[PDB]
Amino acid sequence: EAMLAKTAADNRKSAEQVAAAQADYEKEMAEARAQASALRDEARAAGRSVVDEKRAQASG
């Protein structure tokens, strides 16, 4: 009986764990891509600040 119950719970555990692993992989992919996008946006924002202070200096 214990072996049968094991087999059942083990199959259930594997079935949910494959999906959990896929979900975790997708989550980390999304997090890394979000970090990359944030890096790009921050670089663009810093460049915009640079050109804005350049405009201020040139105007003065």
Which residue number, 7 or 49, has a Cβ lying nearer to another protein?
7
Identify residue 9 by its one-letter amino acid code: A
Which residue number, 9 or 32, has a Cβ lying nearer to another protein?
9
Dist CA 49 CA 44 (whole Å):
9
Site residues, another protein (CB under 8 A): 3-4, 6-7, 10-11, 14
Least Cβ distance, residue 9 to another protein (angstroms): 9
Dist CA 37 CA 20 (whole Å):
25
Which residue number, 14 or 49, has a Cβ lying nearer to another protein?
14
